[PDB]
Amino acid sequence: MTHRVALITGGSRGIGAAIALKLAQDGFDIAITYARNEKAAQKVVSEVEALGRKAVAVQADGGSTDGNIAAITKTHEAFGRLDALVCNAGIYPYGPIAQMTVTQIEEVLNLNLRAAMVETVEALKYMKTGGRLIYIGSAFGERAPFPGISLYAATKAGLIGFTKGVARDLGPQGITANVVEPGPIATDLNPEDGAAAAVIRKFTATESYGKVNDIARTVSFLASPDASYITGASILVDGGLVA
Amino acid sequence: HMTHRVALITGGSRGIGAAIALKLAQDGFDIAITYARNEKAAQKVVSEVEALGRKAVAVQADGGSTDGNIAAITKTHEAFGRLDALVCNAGIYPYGPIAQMTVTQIEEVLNLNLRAAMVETVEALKYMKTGGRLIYIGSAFGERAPFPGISLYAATKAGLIGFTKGVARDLGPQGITANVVEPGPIATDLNPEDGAAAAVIRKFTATESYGKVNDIARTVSFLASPDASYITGASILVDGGLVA
Amino acid sequence: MTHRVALITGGSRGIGAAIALKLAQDGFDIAITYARNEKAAQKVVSEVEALGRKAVAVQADGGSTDGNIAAITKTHEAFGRLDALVCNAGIYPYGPIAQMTVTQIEEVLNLNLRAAMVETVEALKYMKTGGRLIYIGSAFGERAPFPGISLYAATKAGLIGFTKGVARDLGPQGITANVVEPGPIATDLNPEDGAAAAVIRKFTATESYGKVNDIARTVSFLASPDASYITGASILVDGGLVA
Amino acid sequence: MTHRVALITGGSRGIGAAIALKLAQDGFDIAITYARNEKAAQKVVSEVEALGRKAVAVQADGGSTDGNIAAITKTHEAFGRLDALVCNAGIYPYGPIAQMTVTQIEEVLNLNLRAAMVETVEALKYMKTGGRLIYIGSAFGERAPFPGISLYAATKAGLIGFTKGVARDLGPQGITANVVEPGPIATDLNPEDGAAAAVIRKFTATESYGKVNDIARTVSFLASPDASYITGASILVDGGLVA
């Protein structure tokens, strides 16, 4: 228990993986959650270990409350402490509101909002003064500039409200709660080239997609002990999309 | 049959919902209201709408189940043959520090305060046409959480802001508007304006007062008007200055 | 002094004129300010008088503090009371920030923010419980979706902040302060035709410009004695532009 | 011209001074503006020089457009380049809106909003891709929780709008514009003492004043070359006041 411990949900690839590595460099031991691809998770585990930190991968369905609880539980069993929770796992449904099914609605709520709520409750059994709760929201929580993202925008705006309320509750306990709001970020699964990306890019002021490091450095900034006076905050990292 | 616009108000058997139902009826809407259990309160609202010259019906439905959300729309369309406004008013207010919340409270608030609006909206769009109105009852606490104990409620109510923005964007060219009304503390039977707890909440308002159900009903009426066609994606705080 | 009195700045044409007529129908006696164009002001005065209300036109440069003070002073001399102030006068500079001159900066601050502030202070020498302060902001105070409007967006966001602070101050005195935020509204001066308008329109969800009645109705809704619980609020009337 | 150059207005004391030292440590040569108090300014200069950087203090009235222009001009004359502008100078009027004079209104507008606008225009004559514009706003630009701060809230909300519009204009040029929003910060100029301070603390979720380093760290985070995808953003550093 000599190092701070960070749990990153969906930490096996993309933004999550980059956060895990950045926090490991900052001196956190690392737990990540993954739904299915054990090999991608073990790769992240190895890269964290190559930096001299301990890492563990926990299999968990972020869409289930049992999986939300088990992620915290297994992290605490592995390390004996919990210092930062980064709720990064999420999905992006896309389509006109009139075509959305009950299943899509339940899925996006369960993964993008309920998970964060349930994981936060469970984390607070273990977290102490100096703790950090960081939610990965979206710029689309503040602006929905094109059709097809009503469900996503709802869940991501929900995280802003949750963050404000939690920050208010935990202020005197010395735990902070903040939301990072990515714009379009290039990853394997979300490429920056092509006509669909061009449409999204046009709503950014920089006319570009960002990169995973743009988010990881902002999580690192918030997770620092020196960020003790930042709570309730939202940080847009979006190339000016919401401007 | 079908000569008047029809409004469905969820949770319309008492408090804000009931007042919205009466105000819309006076504006010329036939009324459907949902209720979970108190049939007598629902029938009282039905009678008061009828006394104003409109048709009214009360539909029993659990807003916390998706089947109830679908049925509310289905039964309203069966009774009246059209749907012109949906007012998603039903909701619950859990209270307590976040570390004391249970899984069940979390599911219940999400199910009623957010999922219901989403599923009801999808179903309403099977029937709604140009000139339609989607009006969600959010809260001032969706924008400001000035004291501890309201994390879950704030989350769901902020969620409705984001949903409203996205839906407004989707439906703009179809001539259906989507807007959110954000009440501060409103006095009702269940939420009285007197007592030490209310004195604390009241101090966060600029007017140092609770509002009344008419404050919210009027605002719904303003948004539901056909003349409100250029208002969409909007939030209207009716909160005595709480969020200032 | 039998009727409530509303002062509307810039009330001789466009949005201002439509507000003046709508409030006259609601039962307010009317004062309007005009910078130039006495004949347009006198037409508004006649239309208000045709409805049975008293009306006066006051010449005043909204960009000078002496004009800001005189507008209130002359209104109170003509009617003996003041019940609503609608700060509608303003300008819309357009262009890249690096090309803006000191003169354009001063002019927009003077007319779009300083005027509202000075007029509000003067109005509060006469206003009592039941009073109404209504500022005409802009949707661009909340979203600046294209280049060229940095100055305008600054002043119109400034009104939002002013509104919040004033609402807070005046709460216990029974005066409300609220901002109406128009999107693009078709008027004589802002036609609706042309490639520029086509670009703006595409940012709205309705893909249309609004009309003056959309704003007048909203002012009327706020100015009512039944709007006593609405204070600090912003109302977007923008066809979904800010969505 | 081997190092990046940062100009910090009001950089002789409090938040400004802390920002100047932090950016010096990040590797910026430093220009600071001061109105009066040359000895405080010369102290900051000496501390920057002790770190191995070049520093200069420029006397300038931030409330005069000539002073706004001269700050940039003298900075460019000393160093031959400009890489970051931090608009930190400002004032905090306090009192009920009805008691505010025309002189107070002009003053707050001139120092808190016009200065930033004019300095930004002049800076863009020299700044290039990789440039940083960072405005020091306030949490009170988003929330005015008590009476007496209308004017200040207006100017600070104005900066948010200005930041959004500027970010939108400069996005494709590779210059970012962002606003930091301090809550109550204990400073040499704004001590954590008295009944007014006691009232302000109670609105924060942490029930505390912050410290200058809380702001300086955040400016440093935004001024980095790795912050390129952050633009149009506001970062609350306010102990949860706006929650």
DSSP result, B59-110? EE--TTSHHHHHHHHHHHHHHHS---EEEE-------S-GGG--HHHHHHHH
CB-count burial class (<10 Å; 0-12, 13-18, 19+) for C230: buried
Catalytic, D152? Answer yes
* A142 → chain C, closest CA residue: C243
Q: Which residues, 6+ apart, have CB-to-CB distance to B225 below 8 Å?
A: B27
Q: Which of A144, A203, A243 sits opposite C144 (nearest CB)?
A: A243
- Give this entry's resolution in angstroms: 2.2
Torsion sign across C-alpha atoms C172, C174, C177, C180: positive
Q: CB distance D168–C158 less than 8 Å?
A: no
d(CA D131, CA D231): 11
Interface of A with D (CB under 8 A): 164-165, 167-168, 170-172, 174, 183, 204-208, 210-211, 213-214, 217-218, 221, 226-243
CB-CB neighbors (< 8 A) of A172 in chain D: 205-207
Order of strands, sheet of D132-136, starting from the edge strand that comes earlier in the sequence: D55-59, D29-34, D5-8, D84-87, D132-136, D176-182, D234-237
**Cα D171 to Cα A218, B82, B133, C179, distances in angstroms:** 20, 48, 37, 29
Q: CB distance C113–D154 less than 8 Å?
A: yes
Subunits in contact with chain B (3 or more CB pairs closer than 8 Å): A, C, D
Chain pair C-D, CB pairs under 8 angstroms: 144
d(CA D59, CA D81): 19
At D167 the three-state DSSP class reads helix
Pairing of strands B235-238, C84-87: unpaired
Interface of B with D (CB under 8 A): 144-146, 204, 243-244
Per-residue buried b or exposed e for D138-161, using 16+ beta carbons within 10 Å of the residue's own CB: bbbbbbbbbbbbbbbbbbbbbbbb
At C170 the three-state DSSP class reads helix
At A234 the three-state DSSP class reads strand
Please report the domains of chain D, with CATH numbers, ordered by start residue: 1-243 (3.40.50.720)
Subunits in contact with chain A (3 or more CB pairs closer than 8 Å): B, C, D
CB-count burial class (<10 Å; 0-12, 13-18, 19+) for D55: buried
Question: Which of the residues of A are catalytic?
Answer: 152
d(CA A12, CA A41): 5
* B242 → chain D, closest CA residue: D145
Experimental technique of record: X-ray
Interface of C with B (CB under 8 A): 164-165, 167-168, 170-172, 174, 183, 204-208, 210-211, 213-214, 217-218, 221, 226-243
Subunits in contact with chain D (3 or more CB pairs closer than 8 Å): A, B, C
Interface of B with C (CB under 8 A): 164-166, 168-169, 171-173, 175, 184, 205-209, 211-212, 214-215, 218-219, 222, 227-244
* Encoded tokens for D83: 């890489």
Angle (deg, nearest 10), helices C115-123 and C150-170: 20
d(CA B109, CA B113): 6
With CA atoms as reference, report the closest residue to B33 among B17, B44, B19: B17
d(CA D160, CA C154): 7
Q: Which of B145, B204, B243 sits opposite D243 (nearest CB)?
A: B145
Residue A209's φ and ψ, nearest 5 degrees, are -85, 150
d(CA C214, CA C110): 27
Polymer length in residues for chain A: 243
d(CA B69, CA B121): 9
d(CA B33, CA B28): 15
CB A203 within 8 A of CB A145: yes
CB D102 within 8 A of CB D117: no
* A227 → chain D, closest CA residue: D214
